[PDB]
Amino acid sequence: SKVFKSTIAPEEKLRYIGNHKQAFDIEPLYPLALFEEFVATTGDCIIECSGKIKQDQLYPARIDLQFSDKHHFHNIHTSIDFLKRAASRTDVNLNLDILATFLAGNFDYSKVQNILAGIDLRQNLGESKLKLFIRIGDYPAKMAVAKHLCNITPESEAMLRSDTLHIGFDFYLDGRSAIELYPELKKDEFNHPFIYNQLKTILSPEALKPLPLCNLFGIGLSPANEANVLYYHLENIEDFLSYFPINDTARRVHDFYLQQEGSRRMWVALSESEMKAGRINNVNLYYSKAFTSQNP
Amino acid sequence: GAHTI
Numbered sequence: 248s249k250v251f252k253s254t255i256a257p258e259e260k261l262r263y264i265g266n267h268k269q270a271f272d273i274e275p276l277y278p279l280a281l282f283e284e285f286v287a288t289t290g291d292c293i294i295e296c297s298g299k300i301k302q303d304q305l306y307p308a309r310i311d312l313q314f315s316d317k318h319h320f321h322n323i324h325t326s327i328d329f330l331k332r333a334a335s336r337t338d339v340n341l342n343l344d345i346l347a348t349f350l351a352g353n354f355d356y357s358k359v360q361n362i363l364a365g366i367d368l369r370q371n372l373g374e375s376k377l378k379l380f381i382r383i384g385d386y387p388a389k390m391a392v393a394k395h396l397c398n399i400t401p402e403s404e405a406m407l408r409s410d411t412l413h414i415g416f417d418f419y420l421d422g423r424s425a426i427e428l429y430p431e432l433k434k435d436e437f438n439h440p441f442i443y444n445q446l447k448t449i450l451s452p453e454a455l456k457p458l459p460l461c462n463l464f465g466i467g468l469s470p471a472n473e474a475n476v477l478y479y480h481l482e483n484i485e486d487f488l489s490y491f492p493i494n495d496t497a498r499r500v501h502d503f504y505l506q507q508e509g510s511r512r513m514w515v516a517l518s519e520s521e522m523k524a525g526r527i528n529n530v531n532l533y534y535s536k537a538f539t540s541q542n543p
Numbered sequence: 544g545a546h547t548i
């Protein structure tokens with residue numbers, strides 16, 4: 248029946264998503280079933296589950312799938328097929344023009360470094376969105392196009408790096424869309440001495456306090472954001488609560504993932520204003536598990 | 544461990 252073999256069964260990937268749905272009371276929202284049938288068709292991947300917390304409200308129908316192989320053309324085209332199947336519902340409209348602009352011409356797929364596809368679903372259809380992420384490196388023409396779609400000043404444009412850039416696309420089911428750029432610094436960089444004292448001129452000490460816990464730090468820039476979003480990639484999930492005083496709603500998500508098998512790393516995302524507050528009430532939390540075939 | 548280079 249099957250042609251390609253893997254030590255990973257599709258059921259293992261769907262169980263990880265199912266544990267998340269059971270833990271956070273997720274009932275079917277469109278197009279979650281279509282997304283799970285797409286997940287089941289992938290090869291090696293990382294699956295990332297997330298919660299967004301706003302005061303006492305939890306939005307937990309957030310899943311990203313990262314392709315772990317190098318078949319970039321294939322993985323972008325299967326992800327887009329998922330977007331177009333979702334859009335076939337007559338009362339769903341997706342505006343793909345921003346992605347079309349980014350991929351126009353003779354796009355150089357050998358410059359792609361990373362791809363993810365994902366969802367963030369809500370009870371109101373029009374507030375739900377689909378997601379595509381593409382990381383590129385050393386690709387001047389398309390880094391220029393991404394910067395132009397993001398609509399940032401020439402000052403800020405100058406501060407983005409040229410070797411690598413993570414780029415996200417959001418498609419709401421009522422036709423709204425946005426791009427986000429995520430410039431970043433690795434541990435070796437944000438401890439380089441020219442770099443850090445420069446960081447101290449744009450960010451508060453509160454924002455800098457968690458850096459010893461992290462191996463990656465970044466900032467999300469998007470026309471859709473009300474303020475820049477800070478991103479921290481912690482090396483150890485068990486260090487999180489000592490440095491991030493989150494509220495009880497966020498604590499339910501974190502306490503669950505402290506006991507799930509998977510990665511020991513974690514992302515947290517929040518505005519700088521939240522880092523200066525006594526208690527964090529508005530925060531996103533991300534946890535993941537890898538699915539890699541063991542047959543050599 | 545998603546989204547990294």
Ligand SMILES: CC(C)=CCC/C(C)=C/CSP(=O)(O)OP(=O)(O)O
Pocket residue numbers: 299367378413415427429430431464465466467478514516531533546
């Ligand atoms: C490469 C860097 C610095 C950050 C990317 C890490 C990451 C966890 C990204 C997705 S957060 P996002 O999809 O932007 O979440 P929402 O706006 O939908 O709240």
Ligand SMILES: [Mg+2]
Pocket residue numbers: 427467469
């Ligand atoms: Mg965003």
